[PDB]
Amino acid sequence: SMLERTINLYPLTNYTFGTKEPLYEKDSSVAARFQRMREEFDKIGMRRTVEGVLIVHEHRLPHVLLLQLGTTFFKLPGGELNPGEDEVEGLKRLMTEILGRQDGVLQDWVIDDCIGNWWRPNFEPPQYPYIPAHITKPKEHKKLFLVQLQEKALFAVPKNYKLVAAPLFELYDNAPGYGPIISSLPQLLSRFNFIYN
Ligand SMILES: CC1(C)C(=O)N[C@](C)(Cc2cn(-c3ccccc3)nn2)C1=O
Numbered sequence: 001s002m003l004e005r006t007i008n009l010y011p012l013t014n015y016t017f018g019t020k021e022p023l024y025e026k027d028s029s030v031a032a033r034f035q036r037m038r039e040e041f042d043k044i045g046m047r048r049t050v051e052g053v054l055i056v057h058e059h060r061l062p063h064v065l066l067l068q069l070g071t072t073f074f075k076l077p078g079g080e081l082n083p084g085e086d087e088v089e090g091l092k093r094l095m096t097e098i099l100g101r102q103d104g105v106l107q108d109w110v111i112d113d114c115i116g117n118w119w120r121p122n123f124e125p126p127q128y129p130y131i132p133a134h135i136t137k138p139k140e141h142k143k144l145f146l147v148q149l150q151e152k153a154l155f156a157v158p159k160n161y162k163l164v165a166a167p168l169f170e171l172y173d174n175a176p177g178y179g180p181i182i183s184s185l186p187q188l189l190s191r192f193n194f195i196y197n
């Protein structure tokens with residue numbers, strides 16, 4: 001009757017957030033973003049994106065780590081797979097590209113849980129946790145994974161981002177602030193048995 005996955009959390013103070021050079025967005029605007037999505041859809045079909053959910057606690061209060069692009073949009077660490085690239089190897093590659101250390105020591109990323117799937121039916125902002133009616137060729141498939149952190153780690157944050165620890169209550173019913181994926185993380189994380197180490 002214990003059917004829940006057990007996840008170890010560690011205090012935010014166990015982690016060191018260093019700095020490294022800016023990591024520039026491939027798209028300089030929303031219009032460039034959907035232009036490139038259109039171009040690549042014609043060459044290699046549906047975009048495949050992967051996102052990592054990294055959890056910490058402070059005083060037993062779970063927090064999700066978010067990347068804030070300056071003081072603008074909040075992002076999960078992640079990004080686009082190459083054609084034929086494994087989803088889990090790819091999320092590990094991307095999380096290394098974003099948060100990997102300047103001394104080039106490897107993080108031991110542990111990824112054992114899928115926490116959801118989102119689909120983009122058009123070259124437009126809307127995303128859904130299912131393929132909408134009549135949609136045969138979704139333009140993007142986004143996969144979210146829970147990333148189990150080690151007890152301690154050094155992360156190097158690109159200088160153009162802030163790493164922010166968001167408490168679940170701040171995400172919950174806050175789509176305007178965070179959008180539909182991040183704002184549904186409280187619900188999607190509720191099934192886990194978190195251990196507060
Ligand atoms: C922009 C574009 C295409 C992308 O989405 N993924 C790559 C290929 C690599 C990357 C991942 N990030 C990033 C993602 C989330 C938070 C912070 C940084 N910025 N670049 C890109 O460059």
Ligand SMILES: [Zn+2]
Nearest residue numbers: 058059060061
């Ligand atoms: Zn405490």
Ligand SMILES: [Zn+2]
Nearest residue numbers: 119138140141
């Ligand atoms: Zn799909």
